[PDB]
């Protein structure tokens, strides 16, 4: 089960702007995040609408598999999964590094 | 994509350490976690670099994430179960992972 793991490009990114995806017919959160110079600037649609709100968003870091295939929801382009723990159907609880590390940071 | 299927392979769960202990005769220091995986999965062993950051009295109660499907990797006498995940910013160094809010023992990651 190396392997799989060794696979997955998990890494490290700071969410720099939310916005509520009201055009979309399952409720998300739109996310851009800075997942520092080599990786890039990139985007999520995340179905995290029951615990947060876009302005306590900003600037928290996250945990995102980076070498998942992109998939457009209603005109979005959602390049990166964003990892969370799952306590109940709708629920999320994001994951985060226990204290800020660079943003690309590798996870292993 | 094979990416996709070789994340759904993977069990990736939060547990809570019960108990730990320092690991200095690993190959890399480590410290011996003892961790409530919930009552499915139970009580797990993982060995962690984790000297840099942490103390064992600062781990207890702690929330973690690890991949509970691993298998077992055996480090100087001693049987890592799980395999405890952290984001690694340099040579030596692991910050770990935790939910940013609490939840259950066995929580599944997705």
Redesign the interface.
Known sequence: ?????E??DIR?GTIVKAEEFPEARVPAIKLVIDFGTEIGIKQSSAQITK?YKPEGLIN?QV?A?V???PRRIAGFKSEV?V?????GQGDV???????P??NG????
Do not use: A, E, W
Not at 93 to 99: E, G, H, T
Not at 105 to 108: D, M, S
């Open positions: 089960v190396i392997d799989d793991f696979k997955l490290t615990r928290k945990i598999v070498n998942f295939p999964l990892l969370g723990g799952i306590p609880v994001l994951l985060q590094p226990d204290q590390v660079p940071t590798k996870i292993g």
